[PDB]
Amino acid sequence: PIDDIVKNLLKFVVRGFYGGSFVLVLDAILFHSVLAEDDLKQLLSINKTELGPLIARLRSDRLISIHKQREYPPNSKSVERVYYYVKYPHAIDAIKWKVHQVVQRLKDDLDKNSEPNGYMCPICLTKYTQLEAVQLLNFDRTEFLCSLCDEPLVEDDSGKKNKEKQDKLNRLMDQIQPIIDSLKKIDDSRI
Amino acid sequence: HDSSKLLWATEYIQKKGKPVLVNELLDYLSMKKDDKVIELLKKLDRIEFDPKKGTFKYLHSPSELLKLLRSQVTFKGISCKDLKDGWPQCDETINQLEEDSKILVLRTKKDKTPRYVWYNSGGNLKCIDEEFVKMWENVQLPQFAELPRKLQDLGL
Ligand SMILES: [Zn+2]
């Protein structure tokens, strides 16, 4: 069924983009449709200090949501069942938005550091360029002195960072391909 | 005591961890020399008692841990204590059988990584770059069904 790929992708992103205890609770939630928190607590066998944030992340990731499922206890009291209801359409759409926001940011990084031009001074450490400084070239000189320190300049920039950004987009696409495999595969029936 | 001495023998039997002579075990602790400890051991699964010669075991393999992890689906949580008395150095086995072959719950690496029963397909998925997790967490997940609305705009 389409839900398992929804589950499988969830386990992928949360094992890759989150810790193992995140996928332990998600499977724990996925273990039972209406799962009591107490049974979940004993399955983890860990303090509440290590159970809540993982559930909070699943709530924040909207993979699983808290459902106020009507539980009628037999002790003449009012007890709700803390049973997680998985919000699949909001799970995948949020993941896509994260995917979309992460790719464009790193795409924007690629265009940030692409072109070298401009100088500096390396003495008083003020940035310079072609033009302001050619204004400052002197007929008796081949090199641009500094206005401030009266001391000639050097070039400055490095396209290396653009290459560094090229690898990151390469790395992110490799990381994101199985995610966007599952998403499109999920996108067939919007489940 | 009936409960302290037999428990003392079972731990003594557990410490031995090998099929020892029924005479080697009884003199091993010099406490479970009465028939009550043996009868409790035979009536219970704490000590494996069989009609054959003196053999003390439980009532255990990396392959079986996979089976064990598969058998703990939709079920309660078990520590690694039976996995530490239970194929010693399963932490080695978990690290070697990484990528879901031996899953773990590593709360911290100062308590022998006391783990629980965990079932996974990828398990590890360490291919995702750390910065990518940061920039993943750098993105905040938005609100209600306008999230489907925004992505249809994007075409998702
Ligand atoms: Zn200067």
Side-chain angles (χ1 to χ4, degrees), chain A residues 1-62 73-74 87-191, chain B residues 9 17 19 51 54 62-96 114 122-153 155:
Chain A
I2 186 59
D3 210 330
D4 296 332
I5 298 182
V6 176
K7 291 177 161 48
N8 203 15
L9 162 65
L10 282 174
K11 302 179 194 298
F12 290 154
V13 55
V14 66
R15 270 174 307 214
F17 295 95
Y18 290 102
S21 66
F22 291 91
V23 65
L24 261 68
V25 302
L26 187 153
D27 307 346
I29 285 181
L30 293 191
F31 282 165
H32 321 76
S33 307
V34 174
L35 173 56
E37 188 184 18
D38 296 330
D39 292 315
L40 193 140
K41 176 70 174 67
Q42 301 298 287
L43 168 56
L44 299 187
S45 65
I46 57 188
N47 263 325
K48 297 293 294 184
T49 185
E50 297 184 354
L51 188 153
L54 308 170
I55 301 299
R57 175 58 64 169
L58 302 184
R59 263 52 166 162
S60 72
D61 300 339
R62 304 163 74 165
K87 202 50 174 299
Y88 316 91
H90 295 175
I92 60 167
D93 295 339
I95 298 310
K96 288 193 288 183
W97 177 232
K98 252 165 176 177
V99 171
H100 298 353
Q101 192 69 220
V102 298
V103 58
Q104 68 98 6
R105 177 215 66 79
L106 183 49
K107 166 58 186 178
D108 293 342
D109 300 355
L110 169 81
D111 306 317
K112 164 190 43 182
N113 308 123
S114 44
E115 201 63 283
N117 64 6
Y119 291 170
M120 297 192 208
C121 196
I123 297 89
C124 58
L125 289 163
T126 61
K127 298 275 183 292
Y128 293 99
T129 313
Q130 311 318 131
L131 296 176
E132 300 72 2
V134 67
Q135 171 51 83
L136 191 51
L137 179 86
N138 324 297
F139 277 166
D140 63 358
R141 281 266 287 100
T142 179
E143 172 70 19
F144 301 116
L145 273 160
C146 180
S147 305
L148 294 174
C149 53
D150 193 343
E151 287 164 359
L153 306 173
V154 298
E155 311 192 11
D156 173 71
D157 193 357
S158 190
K160 287 175 216 304
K161 321 170 178 183
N162 183 34
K163 298 290 187 183
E164 303 158 11
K165 299 310 186 303
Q166 171 64 34
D167 304 332
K168 288 181 178 62
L169 267 165
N170 184 359
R171 198 186 311 173
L172 176 54
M173 291 325 88
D174 194 16
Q175 300 312 318
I176 194 66
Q177 192 282 329
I179 310 310
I180 68 173
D181 174 5
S182 296
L183 285 167
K184 287 304 173 306
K185 204 68 177 181
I186 293 160
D187 293 352
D188 70 332
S189 66
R190 286 267 66 87
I191 299 183
Chain B
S63 59
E64 296 163 21
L65 178 69
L66 278 168
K67 272 63 176 184
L68 185 56
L69 296 179
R70 264 54 169 181
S71 184
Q72 289 294 326
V73 59
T74 76
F75 282 143
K76 291 297 183 177
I78 53 180
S79 310
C80 291
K81 288 307 295 182
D82 60 2
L83 304 181
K84 302 289 104 177
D85 312 330
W87 183 239
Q89 212 65 26
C90 186
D91 53 342
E92 190 276 331
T93 306
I94 282 173
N95 299 337
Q96 300 307 317
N124 188 359
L125 291 194
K126 63 181 184 300
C127 184
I128 294 282
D129 188 75
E130 314 309 315
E131 178 180 355
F132 294 173
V133 177
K134 273 75 178 173
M135 60 156 308
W136 185 260
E137 300 161 1
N138 284 148
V139 183
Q140 170 60 33
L141 286 186
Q143 207 58 245
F144 192 67
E146 86 283 336
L147 175 66
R149 302 189 328 182
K150 64 90 176 179
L151 61 83
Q152 294 293 330
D153 299 330

